[PDB]
Amino acid sequence: TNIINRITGKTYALELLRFYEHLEQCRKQGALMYFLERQGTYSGLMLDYDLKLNTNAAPSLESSVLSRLCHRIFVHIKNSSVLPEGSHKIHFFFTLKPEAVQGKYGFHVLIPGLKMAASTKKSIIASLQHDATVQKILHEQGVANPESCLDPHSASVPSLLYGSSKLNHRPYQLKTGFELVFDSSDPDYIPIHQIKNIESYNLVSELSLTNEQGSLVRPVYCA
Numbered sequence: 518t519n520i521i522n523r524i525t526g527k528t529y530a531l532e533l534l535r536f537y538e539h540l541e542q543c544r545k546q547g548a549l550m551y552f553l554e555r556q557g558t559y560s561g562l563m564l565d566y567d568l569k570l571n572t573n574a575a576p577s578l579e580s581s582v583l584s585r586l587c588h589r590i591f592v593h594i595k596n597s598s599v600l601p602e603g604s605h606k607i608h609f610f611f612t613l614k615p616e617a618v619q620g621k622y623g624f625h626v627l628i629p630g631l632k633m634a635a636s637t638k639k640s641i642i643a644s645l646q647h648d649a650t651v652q653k654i655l656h657e658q659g660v661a662n663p664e665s666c667l668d669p670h671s672a673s674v675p676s677l678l679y680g681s682s683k684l685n686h687r688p689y690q691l692k693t694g695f696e697l698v699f700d701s702s703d704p705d706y707i708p709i710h711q712i713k714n715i716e717s718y719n720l721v722s723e724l725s726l727t728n729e730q731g732s733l734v735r736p737v738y739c740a
């Protein structure tokens with residue numbers, strides 16, 4: 518799937534890949550969009566980090582720091598006990614607010630390929646509240662609300678498609694994406710590597726929580 522055009526209010530019930538191909542062409546043509554996808558009850562995981570900052574400068578959110586956030590976020594994903602057996606590639610996408618505005622920053626962690634129930638998403642969001650490392654990481658980034666920056670409604674709110682924004686806001690920009698391989702044959706091995714050539718893919722398509730036809734992002738279905 519369900520797509521909402523915030524600017525027109527029109528909602529669609531999708532053809533999804535062809536839709537995303539058009540949006541990507543619109544996105545690379547700098548078009549102003551306000552498209553959201555409804556997460557529904559079974560789709561990819563999105564984390565909505567609403568950051569209060571100590572300074573008016575955007576946090577550096579370096580790859581090493583974002584990679585550590587991936588590991589911590591995946592730990593809570595793994596701890597949901599919904600992941601399937603075997604070796605699976607899961608992708609973490611960090612879309613960042615373009616600039617800090619009045620000490621308010623934000624980034625989205627997109628795990629679009631990890632299809633899970635909304636209850637599983639909420640349980641992972643709730644589990645993340647107890648992550649002292651995520652809090653320490655964000656605190657060291659200049660975040661003033663590291664214990665309360667993860668929006669508890671991340672599992673519920675419609676997710677802006679990549680390149681789309683809210684009414685008077687700028688669209689979040691993908692800083693980087695990480696490829697995570699989790700193998701039941703080696704649970705302690707969590708290789709998190711930056712995705713090579715993320716820009717060669719349809720970012721609207723790949724980052725969509727409801728998409729199941731992505732090329733880079735292949736659905737991994739949770740229980």
Ligand SMILES: Nc1ccn([C@H]2C[C@H](O)[C@@H](COP(=O)(O)OP(=O)(O)OP(=O)(O)O)O2)c(=O)n1
Nearest residue numbers: 553565566567614622623674675676677683689
């Ligand atoms: N009027 C609207 C429009 C969209 N959403 C959805 C779209 C985002 O994907 C999600 C995240 O919640 P935010 O309100 O924080 O949206 P952003 O993260 O994009 O904005 P900000 O940078 O201010 O945090 O909520 C919303 O809650 N309210």
Ligand SMILES: [Mn+2]
Nearest residue numbers: 565566567623
């Ligand atoms: Mn937000």
Ligand SMILES: [Mn+2]
Nearest residue numbers: 643644646647
């Ligand atoms: Mn809890």
Ligand SMILES: [Mn+2]
Nearest residue numbers: 565566567668
């Ligand atoms: Mn929010």
